[PDB]
Amino acid sequence: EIEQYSVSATYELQREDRALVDTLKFVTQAEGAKQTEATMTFKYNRQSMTLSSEVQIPDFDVDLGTILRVNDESTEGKTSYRLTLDIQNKKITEVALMGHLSCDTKEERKIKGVISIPRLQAEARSEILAHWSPAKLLLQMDSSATAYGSTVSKRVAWHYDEEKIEFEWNTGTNVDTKKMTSNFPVDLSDYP
């Protein structure tokens, strides 16, 4: 059923419409009626500066797919970017990471970090804004997260004015017993 075994590291410059992908494939397989293809492929989009890593081993149900997306929104008047990371077991994103950078060198400076986990109800939010102005700089802080019936919020705002100087800070960390109980399973499949 097999004529030979070959292990090969084949590089290929693949086309994605506009983009060109420096694709390197690492495959270990049997050759013949029986195929033992265990492939570890890794692809980079040099036109979208995006890296993708792929592995397939059906014997152990491995179809993992990892993508690191970097999208350039940067210009002379605005340094901006958008970062995306898809943690896909069986090509299903069970952990996702996103970032949005929009910094106007003139006044606006936006930073936003997001963490989301669908199956575990784990979400974290880290968002920052800094509106510059020669007269004054305005600061805003936003950091919050939610997981298993727990709410975490941190709100700190400061602002200067000639008439007055104003500062505040509110700390929020609340937990609901029933909501946490429902969110966190206190039951197991075979335990009953």
């Binding site: 104003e166 500062f167 800070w169 609340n174 206190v186 009953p192």
Partner: protein
């Protein structure tokens, strides 16, 4: 509710790990609300 838990325990046949009965308040809130504000208006006192 522990009485019902015990009744279930009589057959040694529970359904959950531990006792999901909660004595503590359903809502557990811990917060801090602090602020600093000062009126440094540009007005001034003239002195000789």
């Amino acid at each position: 509710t522990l009485q019902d838990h015990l009744n279930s325990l009589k057959e040694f046949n529970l359904q959950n790990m531990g006792l999901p009965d909660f004595h503590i308040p359903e809502n557990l809130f811990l917060k801090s609300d602090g602020r600093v504000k000062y009126t440094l208006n540009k007005n001034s006192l003239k002195i000789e």
